[PDB]
């Protein structure tokens, strides 16, 4: 994670912004309603 | 069926100066 | 400070943020 | 400071993870598949134990972690006073964190515990029905007065001093000049920034007070009976210590069902308390 | 923008309060199960709302649903095209608002439209409906007509409850006639913000005292009150009592024992005669449903204040303790905001 | 000086108190004391009806007999209570008029008295609720134990709403503050380059450093008025909570909870939330001496 | 755990017996806890010297009222205790829409319900009440 540090500029960055609340959801939601 | 009415008479105080207001800051 | 890292990594234990977030709508629905 | 990172973290996946994923079956019942009023995670089973993930993790070894790695973990002001006071200065934050943080946990994890088995809790309600119980079988001490003084003294000093330094550019600005407006009405501030140095030996004595309060109480202490009035007691009496001792003494004594060996036959209507029920 | 702040705050107000009481009306309306549920549906039978029990669903839903939709229709309709002061336009006009203390005066006529909108709408029923009290059905009628104490008496409701509807035509009229009348100079410091906390303050002890008014004295026939959850239940108690034994006269504590302690300055008796003999059947097992169910906080042990099970909802409970509370802190902070309008000309922060 | 009450009020609230706790050296120890209330009730007298007495009580007119009035119920804690209304209101009257005329000082004063008046307006409000009587503060005033036992059972009930933020800010803010009020006073704006001779060396007339280097792991006060938003919001956001919730706790109070009980055929599994909370309050304080016996449903 | 076992309430004083669904239960939990739970909290009494409904209450009445077609009509024909007095203007009931408007559109379909809802209510527990 180099480049400059950040403040109030990076929101979502784009990719991985919406696939992160997508795997997230794939492990939890998964592994209680049927593990 | 419009079995929708009370769905629109809360949110009608709940929604506005709380999401519509706090975070555009416009006033 | 690092240049390898640094900032992430509170990340990886606010991960756990999300997982009690799916848990607790998982048996609140069902 | 790699170990205040790793205290953090194992008390933060621990109290997050027990209440969302665990449950008890030794003590009552609680964080029923991530749905509890309260979300209490301790337990404590009445007692190397075993050598698992859930077997072990299910009798006890919840609070068993977070007093472990949560309280020997500590720092804050240990780790503070070792980098602040080398490159900045002024290590008087690290006395208020050594007390007011430090004997409030050390006490309920040193003092009630092996003193048997169940501390205490460590949720919303669970803190709230320990703090409620325990100090019905006690309560009325000369320590806890303090404790309780100290919660009263510091944040009325904090806000006696926000509300007269705010409404003390423009004329106001921030110089004082304030100690003739607030003397001719209560005392006076002799200044010397002492304003600083005052609530911090108000909320850290007070806290090292009532912790050495409770930590005598389990150790065995006398708290409960003011015993020249329990002794003055022939006929008619009553008081504010007759109507204290009949409302916890009664109400501790039914509803049991802390103890899931001590406890038996308390029901069978013969039991304490009638008024009108 | 100081009018259009006002307007599009009524018809945000009015909307949301209709609009809740129009989806409640018909999410409720069991068949005879009522106090279930319905602050604003019980303000509406103490002017036009049929009598004591629920009147049918064709006819009956008239002057319910019909009147509520049409209150907000016609106040989001007003609001949503008053509320272009707000967007667009002259920034502040005057006409014939510069916080001048001669033209405050005459400005601010919201008297003659409060007290021709108060008594207007209190007088009503005296040529449509009458209210629903004192007798077990409805209609208005006569003028029981300052009449009462001069001190604070929020309940005036008493015996006569058609002293409350002349109280309004008489205080209203005097009220309208002489504050379009009144439009040394040294009376506090006149400002915009001078008379908005006055004007919240006032408002503010007026919330706090109805928050009890309305849960004491008459008000509302439907819901309980804690002279409701302790008289009727000392009359559930005794009755069930006398039924088996009777003759209330002994000592099981400190006197009183089944009923009638006679303390103060009364007998508390409420008539011996009525007690032996008696004269309710029907009205003394409909009273018995009420103390029941408790009004402070309805919801292994039992079921009350202390661990429950199944249960409803508490009647006037919900209204003194979300508008009474808010009715206090606003109060707090507009005696609060009164202190910066008194020291920001001779001060300044 | 400004307003003529607050003289009236704080010598005749403290006159009177100094000699009702002197009635009663028969048994207090300094501790519990107000040993007359055992007669009959606590203190049943139906004080006014409706938001009090105002069409025109037991205060300033005895009445009755003389020395046998004073001693029955509330007696002399009807008028002390009328001083406390009168005491704080020209506690903060006074207050915001010693400070705006003195010289310039806004605010502070009705902000500082919510806190004040968070307890004293809450001693008075519940009466006009519940029961107008003067049951709730014990006569006299010693210790209060009765307000931390019953305020618990009913009347408020289980804290567990709103009275669980408030007494989370006061507790917690007196941990905050005492940390806050130690850094600077270590070294900043009021010493860090005075004495220090390793005893007390001559002084002579860091803030700004020590404001988020201290403070940091995460970020600053960000502010020269941070600090003081901060000691504002543990006498506003604590005090606007606790009156809120006694406010609310006449009749209908809250507590929620009820109980889980959710088993697989159901049954009642129990746990720590509202079925082991109740079971040593509902039991224990429902143990009121001895005054109920016809009613069953509220004490 | 609801098994087959448990909701098999009897229909009768003779030996017979009904067998109730999951969706029956259902219904009448939520008619007997919103409409008479007003005072009877619990399955307990608010104004009656301890008249619990319990499976050792109701078979000691006149007749056995612990049975499915015992219980269902006393609910509309209320009774006193011994059953001599007749307690239908005193007591709620279906038979007496005049006072009871909350079972006014109820049938005789919801009258077996919120009996079987009792019974059943007994058989949770090992004898705690
Ligand atoms: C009211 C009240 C107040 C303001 C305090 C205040 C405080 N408590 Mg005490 N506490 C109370 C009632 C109160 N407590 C009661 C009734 C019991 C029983 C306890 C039991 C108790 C324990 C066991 C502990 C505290 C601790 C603390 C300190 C944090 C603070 C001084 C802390 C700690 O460990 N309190
Ligand atoms: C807040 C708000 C504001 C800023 C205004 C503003 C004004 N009103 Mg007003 N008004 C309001 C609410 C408001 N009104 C409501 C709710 C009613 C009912 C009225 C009834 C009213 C009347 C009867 C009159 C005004 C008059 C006026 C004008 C003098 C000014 C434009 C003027 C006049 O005669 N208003
Ligand atoms: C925009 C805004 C909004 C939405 C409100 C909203 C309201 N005001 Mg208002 N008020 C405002 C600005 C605003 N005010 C300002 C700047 C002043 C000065 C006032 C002075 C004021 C008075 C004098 C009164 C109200 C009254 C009222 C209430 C009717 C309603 C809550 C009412 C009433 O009597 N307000
Ligand atoms: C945006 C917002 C919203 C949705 C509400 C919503 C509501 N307000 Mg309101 N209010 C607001 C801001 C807001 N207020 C502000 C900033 C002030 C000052 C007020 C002053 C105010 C008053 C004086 C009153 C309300 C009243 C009401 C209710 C009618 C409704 C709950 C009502 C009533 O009498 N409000
Ligand atoms: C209790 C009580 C009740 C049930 C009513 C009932 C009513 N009032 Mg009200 N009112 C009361 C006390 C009461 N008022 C008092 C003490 C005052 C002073 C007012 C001042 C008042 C005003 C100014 C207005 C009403 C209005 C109304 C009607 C809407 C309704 C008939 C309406 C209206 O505009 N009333
Ligand atoms: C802009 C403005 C500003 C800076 C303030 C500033 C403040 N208000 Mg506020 N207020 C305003 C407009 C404004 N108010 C208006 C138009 C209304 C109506 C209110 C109603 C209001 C309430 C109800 C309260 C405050 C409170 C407060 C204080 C916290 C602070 C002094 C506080 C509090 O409880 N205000
Ligand atoms: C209204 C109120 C009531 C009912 C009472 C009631 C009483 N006061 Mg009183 N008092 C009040 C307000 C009130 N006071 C205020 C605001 C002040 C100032 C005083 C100052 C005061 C004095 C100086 C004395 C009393 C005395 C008395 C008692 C005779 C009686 C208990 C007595 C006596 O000597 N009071
Ligand atoms: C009980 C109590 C709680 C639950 C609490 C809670 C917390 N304290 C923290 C920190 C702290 N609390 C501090 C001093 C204090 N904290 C106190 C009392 C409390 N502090 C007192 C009395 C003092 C003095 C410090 C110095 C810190 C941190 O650095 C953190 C947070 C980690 C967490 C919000
Ligand atoms: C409980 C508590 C008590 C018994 C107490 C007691 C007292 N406060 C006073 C004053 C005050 N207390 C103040 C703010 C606060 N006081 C607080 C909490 C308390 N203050 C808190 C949390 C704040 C903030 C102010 C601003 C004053 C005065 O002017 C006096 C004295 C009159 C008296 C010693
Ligand atoms: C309420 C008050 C009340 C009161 C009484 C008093 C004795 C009794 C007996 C009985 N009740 Fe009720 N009952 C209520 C609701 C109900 C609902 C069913 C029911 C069934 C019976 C059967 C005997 N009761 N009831
Ligand atoms: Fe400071
Ligand atoms: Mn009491
Ligand atoms: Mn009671
Ligand atoms: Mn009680
Ligand atoms: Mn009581």
Redesign the interface.
């Known amino acids: 994670?180099?480049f400059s540090?950040?403040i109030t500029s990076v929101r979502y960055w784009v990719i991985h912004s919406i696939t992160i609340?997508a795997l997230?959801?794939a492990?939890?939601?998964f592994?209680?309603?049927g593990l | 069926a419009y079995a929708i009415f009370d769905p629109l008479v809360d949110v009608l105080p709940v929604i506005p100066v709380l999401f519509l207001a706090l975070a555009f800051v416009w006033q | 400070p690092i240049?390898?890292?640094?900032?992430?990594a509170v990340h990886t234990l606010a991960?756990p943020t999300?997982?009690?977030?799916?848990?607790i709508?998982?048996?609140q629905f069902? | 400071g790699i170990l205040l990172f790793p205290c953090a973290y194992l008390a933060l996946g621990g109290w997050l993870t027990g209440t969302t994923?665990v449950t008890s079956w030794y003590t009552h019942g609680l964080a029923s598949s991530?749905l509890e009023g309260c979300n209490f995670l301790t337990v404590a089973v009445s007692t190397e134990a075993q050598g698992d993930f859930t077997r072990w993790c299910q009798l006890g070894g919840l609070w068993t972690f977070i007093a472990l790695h949560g309280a020997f973990g500590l720092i804050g002001f240990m780790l503070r006073q070792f980098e602040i006071a080398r490159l900045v200065g002024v290590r008087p934050y690290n006395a208020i964190a050594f007390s007011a943080p430090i004997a409030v946990f050390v006490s309920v994890f040193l003092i009630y515990p092996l003193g048997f088995a169940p501390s205490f809790g460590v949720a919303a309600i669970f803190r709230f029905l320990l703090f409620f119980q325990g100090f019905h079988n006690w309560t009325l001490n000369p320590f806890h007065m303090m404790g309780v003084a100290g919660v009263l003294g510091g944040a009325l000093l904090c806000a006696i001093h926000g509300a007269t330094v705010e409404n003390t550019y423009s004329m106001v600005t921030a110089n004082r000049f304030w100690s003739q407006i607030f003397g001719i009405a209560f005392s006076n501030k002799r200044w010397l920034h002492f304003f600083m140095l005052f609530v911090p030996v108000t909320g850290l004595w007070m806290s090292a007070i009532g912790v050495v309060g409770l930590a005598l109480n389990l150790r065995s202490y006398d708290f409960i009976s003011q015993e020249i009035r329990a002794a003055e007691d022939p006929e008619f009496e009553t008081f504010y210590t007759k109507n204290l001792l009949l409302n916890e003494g009664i109400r501790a004594w039914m509803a049991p069902q802390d103890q899931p060996h001590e406890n038996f036959v308390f029901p069978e209507e013969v039991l304490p308390r009638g008024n009108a029920l | 923008k100081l009018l259009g702040a006002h307007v599009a705050h009524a018809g945000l107000i009015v909307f949301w309060a209709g609009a809740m009481t129009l989806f409640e009306l018909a999410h409720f309306i069991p068949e005879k199960p009522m106090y279930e549920q319905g602050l604003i549906l019980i303000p509406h039978i103490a002017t036009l709302g049929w009598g004591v029990g629920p009147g049918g669903e064709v006819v009956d839903t008239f002057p319910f649903f019909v009147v509520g939709v049409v209150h907000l229709i016609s106040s989001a309709v007003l609001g949503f095209g008053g509320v272009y002061h707000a967007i667009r336009g002259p920034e502040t006009l005057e006409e014939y608002w510069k916080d001048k203390n001669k033209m405050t005066t005459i400005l601010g006529f919201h008297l003659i439209v409060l007290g021709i909108g108060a008594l207007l709408l209190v007088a009503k029923a005296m040529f449509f409906g009458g209210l629903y009290d004192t007798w077990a059905p409805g209609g208005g009628d006569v003028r029981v007509i300052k009449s009462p104490f001069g001190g604070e008496g929020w309940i005036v409701s008493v015996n006569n409850l058609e002293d409350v509807v002349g109280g309004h035509i008489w205080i209203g009229l005097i009220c309208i006639a002489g504050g379009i009348w009144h439009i040394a100079r040294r009376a506090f410091i006149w400002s915009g913000e001078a008379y908005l906390s006055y004007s919240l303050g006032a408002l503010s002890m007026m919330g706090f005292i109805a928050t009890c008014f309305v849960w004491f004295n008459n008000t509302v026939y439907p819901x309980x009150x804690x002279x409701x959850x302790x008289x009727x239940x000392x009359x559930x108690x005794x009755x069930x009592x006398x039924x088996x034994x009777x003759x209330x006269x002994x000592x099981x504590x400190x006197x009183x024992x089944x009923x009638x302690x006679x303390x103060x300055x009364x007998x508390x008796x409420x008539x011996x005669x009525x007690x032996x003999x008696x004269x309710x059947x029907x009205x003394x097992x409909x009273x018995x449903x009420x103390x029941x169910x408790x009004x402070x906080x309805x919801x292994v042990g039992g079921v009350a204040t202390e661990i429950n099970s199944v249960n409803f909802v508490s009647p006037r409970s919900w209204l003194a303790t979300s508008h009474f509370v808010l009715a206090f802190f606003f109060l707090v902070g507009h005696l609060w905001h009164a202190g910066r309008a008194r020291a920001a000309a001779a001060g300044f922060e | 000086w400004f307003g003529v009450i607050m003289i009236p009020t704080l010598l005749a609230a403290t006159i009177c108190f100094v000699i009702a706790f002197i009635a009663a050296p028969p048994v207090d120890i300094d501790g519990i004391r107000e040993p007359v209330s055992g007669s009959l009730l606590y203190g049943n007298n139906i004080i006014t009806g409706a938001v009090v007495p105002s069409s025109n009580h037991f205060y300033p007119i005895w009445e009755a007999a003389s020395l046998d009035e004073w001693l029955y119920n509330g007696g002399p804690y009807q008028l002390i209570i009328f001083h406390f209304l009168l005491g704080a209101s020209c506690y903060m009257g006074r207050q915001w008029e010693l400070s705006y005329r003195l010289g310039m000082r806004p605010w502070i004063c009705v902000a500082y008295s919510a806190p004040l008046a968070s307890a004293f307006a809450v001693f008075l409000i519940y009466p006009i609720g519940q029961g107008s009587f003067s049951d709730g503060m014990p006569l006299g005033i010693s210790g209060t134990f009765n307000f931390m036992i019953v305020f618990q059972a009913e009347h408020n009930i289980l804290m567990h709403p709103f009275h669980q933020l408030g007494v989370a800010g006061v507790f917690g803010g007196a941990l905050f503050c005492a940390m806050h009020g130690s850094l600077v006073t270590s070294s900043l704006i009021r010493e860090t380059t005075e004495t220090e001779s390793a005893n007390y060396g001559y002084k002579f007339g860091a803030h700004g450093y020590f404001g988020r280097l201290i403070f940091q792991y995460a970020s600053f006060n960000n502010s020269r008025s941070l600090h003081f938003f901060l000691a504002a919001w543990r006498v506003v956001g604590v005090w606007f909570a606790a009156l809120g919730i006694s406010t609310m706790a006449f009749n209908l109070n809250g507590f929620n909870f009820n109980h889980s009980v959710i088993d697989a055929k159901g049954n009642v599994i129990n746990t720590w939330a509202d079925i082991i909370n109740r079971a040593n309050l509902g039991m224990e304080v429902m143990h009121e001496r001895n005054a109920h016996n016809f009613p069953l449903d509220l004490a | 755990e609801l098994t087959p076992e448990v909701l098999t309430v009897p229909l009768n004083s003779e030996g017979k017996t009904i067998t109730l669904t999951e969706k029956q239960y259902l219904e009448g939990k939520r008619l007997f806890q919103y409409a008479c739970a007003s005072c009877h909290v619990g399955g307990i009494t608010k104004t009656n010297p301890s008249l619990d409904l319990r499976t050792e209450t109701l078979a000691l009445a006149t007749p056995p009222r612990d049975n499915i077609e015992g219980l269902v009509d006393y609910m509309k024909n209320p009774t006193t205790y011994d059953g001599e007095q007749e307690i239908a203007e005193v007591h709620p009931s279906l038979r007496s829409a005049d006072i009871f408007p909350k079972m006014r559109n109820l049938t005789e379909k919801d009258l077996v319900a919120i009996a079987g809802h009792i019974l059943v209510e007994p058989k949770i527990l090992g004898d705690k009440w």
């Open positions: 994670r180099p540090d950040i609340p997230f959801i492990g939890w939601l592994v209680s309603t | 240049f390898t890292v640094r900032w992430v991960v999300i997982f009690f977030l799916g848990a709508a998982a048996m069902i | 994923f991530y």
